[PDB]
């Protein structure tokens, strides 16, 4: 009774998440011990999507950062989809880092996210649900790699036989998440490649600033809320939206919002923007994200703390990480309304170096390492 299986090959373990489709469980291959994730969807659902997703995943298989489907089918009253076990989502890690990412991490993420979207588009699909929650790090030695999930709203944007782009259509309903939805999605215009990239832009700005200007708008109904987010999006300039950020972000948003409906994005131009920014800031390609260094610093500190024996405790760990890796941790400043230069941003390196730390005894121990 404690041995519950899917596809006769996988064993269900700990619940690791819960979506609108249903729940997600850790699992293991019974023969190899390989770790998997198992998604269960009740056949009683009014909006079944797991069958559809499994076909889109299989169609996209082989792309870098596309989860591999191991199995899909019925098990009792559920449909079950077995895929690669992945790590936390970028929204999860955003919370881990107390909801600000450094420029180095935002750039590292942007570059991988560009490749994922470019790959999906090259397979004739648009994702249509771009948000931090749908990008996940791998586990083990896949832990440096961003993966994309949730193809429930994805659709083909061009006909296979003719490569004819889908027709421009209106009156379409807003089907994704409102916070990251493109303006044209609010207008009820058919989404195309440009909309995935515009939404990605909103995600990147959100990572930098901690929030987007259309969060926290209050409304009496759902349609009211969507419309108010729409009006906010329509009326914030790219200049305003990207204030305080390197000019690259504004250039990215202006490009994406300027794309015609059926136009192929210049993905290489977008990547070059951020690659060049990374070079200007002299960020080393070392595969160290904010959370990489925070997790490591925390483990090392807490172990020393234990030998010796909140947000404040986290902030102390963050301060220590920033002193140890001073060239890695550069942040957006809420006060800035201009676009900082690379030298201006790199001033924070010196700040991080000289940042005072609270605990004398523990530090002496960390030094003596």
């Amino acid at each position: 009774a404690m041995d519950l299986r899917v596809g006769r090959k996988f064993r269900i373990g700990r619940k690791i998440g819960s979506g609108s489709f249903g729940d997600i469980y850790h699992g293991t291959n019974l023969i190899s011990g390989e770790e998997v994730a198992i998604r269960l969807e009740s056949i009683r659902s009014r909006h079944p999507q797991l069958d559809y997703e499994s076909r889109v995943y299989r169609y996209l298989s082989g792309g870098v950062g596309i989860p591999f489907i191991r199995w899909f089918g019925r098990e009792g009253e559920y449909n079950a989809m077995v895929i690669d076990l992945l790590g936390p989502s970028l929204e999860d890690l955003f919370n881990y880092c107390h909801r600000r990412f450094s420029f180095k991490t935002v750039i590292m993420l942007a570059l991988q996210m560009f490749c994922r979207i470019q790959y999906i588009h090259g397979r004739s699909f648009i994702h249509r649900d771009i948000k931090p929650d749908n990008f996940l790090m791998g586990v083990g030695r896949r832990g440096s790699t961003v993966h994309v999930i949730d193809f429930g709203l994805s659709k083909k944007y061009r006909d296979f036989n003719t490569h004819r782009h889908i027709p421009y259509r209106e009156n379409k309903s807003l089907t994704g998440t409102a916070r990251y939805a493109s303006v044209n999605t609010h207008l009820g215009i058919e989404q195309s490649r440009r909309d995935d990239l515009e939404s990605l832009g909103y995600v990147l700005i959100y990572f930098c600033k901690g929030s987007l200007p259309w969060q926290g708008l209050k409304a009496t109904t759902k349609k009211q809320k969507y419309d108010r987010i729409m009006e906010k999006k329509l009326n914030v300039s790219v200049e305003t939206l990207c204030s305080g950020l390197p000019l690259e972000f504004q250039e990215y948003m202006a490009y994406c919002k300027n794309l015609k409906f059926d136009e192929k994005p210049d993905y290489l131009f977008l990547a070059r923007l951020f690659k060049d920014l990374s070079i200007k800031l002299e960020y080393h390609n070392d595969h160290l994200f904010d959370w990489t260094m925070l997790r490591y610093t925390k483990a090392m500190v807490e172990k020393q703390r234990d030998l010796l024996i909140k947000s404040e405790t986290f902030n102390k760990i963050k301060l220590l990480a920033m002193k140890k890796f001073p060239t890695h941790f550069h942040y957006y400043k809420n006060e800035d309304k201009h676009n900082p230069s690379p030298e201006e941003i790199k001033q924070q390196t010196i700040l991080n170096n000289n940042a005072a730390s609270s605990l004398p005894e523990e530090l002496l121990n960390a030094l003596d390492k």
Partner: protein
């Protein structure tokens, strides 16, 4: 044997009872005091437990699998994911980030 809402619920109750009460190591990251700090269980189970105290196995294998899954069924197999290759279409993963010092 058959997958039902009720069998699933009962399995999860046993798993979480072991998880909450019976992980008997003394590792800071495994501890209930560490877990109490985090709100999103995936940041613990799929992120902090990627770390390795003994530099051979991660904590999900050395501790979670030992005190939870193995406690439920001794034959419950979990591989060592750190013994896998650095795979061709994946970003380089610096293994040092997992190796807990001291």
């Amino acid at each position: 044997e058959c997958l039902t809402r009720s069998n699933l619920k009962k399995l999860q109750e046993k798993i979480f009872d072991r998880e909450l009460n019976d992980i008997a190591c003394d590792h800071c990251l495994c501890s209930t005091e560490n877990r109490r700090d985090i709100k999103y269980s995936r940041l613990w189970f799929l992120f902090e437990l990627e770390m390795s105290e003994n530099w051979n196995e991660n904590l999900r294998l050395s501790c979670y699998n030992k005190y939870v899954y193995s406690a439920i069924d001794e034959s419950w197999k979990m591989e060592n994911i750190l013994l896998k290759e650095q795979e061709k279409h994946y970003e380089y993963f610096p293994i040092g980030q997992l190796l807990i010092p001291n």
